[PDB]
Amino acid sequence: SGAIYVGNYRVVNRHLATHNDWANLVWEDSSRDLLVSSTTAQGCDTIARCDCQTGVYYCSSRRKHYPVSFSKPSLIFVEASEYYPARYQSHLMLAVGHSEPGDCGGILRCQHGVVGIVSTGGNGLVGFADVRDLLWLDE
Ligand SMILES: NC(=O)[C@H]1CCCN(C(=O)Cc2cc(C(F)(F)F)ccc2Cl)C1
Ligand SMILES: [Zn+2]
Numbered sequence: 218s219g220a221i222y223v224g225n226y227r228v229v230n231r232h233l234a235t236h237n238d239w240a241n242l243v244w245e246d247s248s249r250d251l252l253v254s255s256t257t258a259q260g261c262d263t264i265a266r267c268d269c270q271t272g273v274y275y276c277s278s279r280r281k282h283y284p285v286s287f288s289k290p291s292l293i294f295v296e297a298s299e300y301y302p303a304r305y306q307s308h309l310m311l312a313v314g315h316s317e318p319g320d321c322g323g324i325l326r327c328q329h330g331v332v333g334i335v336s337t338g339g340n341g342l343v344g345f346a347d348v349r350d351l352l353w354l355d356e
Contacts, residue, residue, distance in 0.1 A: 219275070219322025221331050222260025223354050228253050230321045230336055230346070232300035247301070249308050250336045250346050253354070264354050265329035272332050274343065275323040276315055285312040287325070290347040295337055308347045309336065316343035 221228035229238060231245050231252040238254040245252040270289065273282050287310040297303040310325075316338030323335040325345045337344030348354065 218319065219277070219324065219334060221262050221264075221324065221334060221348065222256065223262045223264055223331070224260060224356070225256050225258075226253050226260070226354055227256050228334065228348060228354070230334060233321060248304075248306060250301075250306060251348070253351075262324075263330040264351070265327050265332045265349055266352075266355075267327060267329040267349065269327035269329065269332065272325050272327040274312075274314065274325040274335060274345065276335075276343075277320050277323055278317040279315055283314050285314050285325075285343070287312040287345060290350070293337075293344070295344075306337065306344075306346075308350070310345045310347055312343050312345070313341055314343040315341070 234252040241254045243253040273284050275282050290308040292305050292307050293309045295306045320335050325332045333345040333347045336346040
């Protein structure tokens with residue numbers, strides 16, 4: 218679990234969105250595994266606006282933050298799960314790192330701010346949904 222809190226927005230994995238998130242919906246995209254809802258309180262996270270390919274992510278299954286090198290956002294095949302059929306997920310970045318299903322939502326960040334959140338994983342791989350192109354999160 219986990220979210221990004223920027224301005225009056227809450228960014229979460231679409232597959233983990235709550236009823237309150239759907240009842241206060243701003244934008245959602247199944248192909249990216251992202252959903253954004255509105256908040257009453259102002260958040261403290263800032264979004265990175267850069268092309269970094271190194272950063273640090275939070276891994277809840279180890280209670281640790283790990284440095285990682287990650288690929289550029291791209292269209293990647295994701296196997297069927299209890300949340301989606303087998304499909305291509307867009308704006309996804311991969312890295313070598315530990316992850317488990319419940320790690321979704323952990324923040325990936327660089328020197329400029331938040332880059333994205335954990336969305337997929339494998340045997341020693343972790344995948345992040347990029348948010349750097351969502352310029353409207355800043356206003
Ligand atoms: N974005 C999606 O389509 C995800 C929806 C939730 C399911 N999903 C995953 O990747 C779940 C996952 C599996 C492993 C495993 F192989 F070890 F078991 C590690 C990490 C994760 Cl995040 C895909
Ligand atoms: Zn950066």
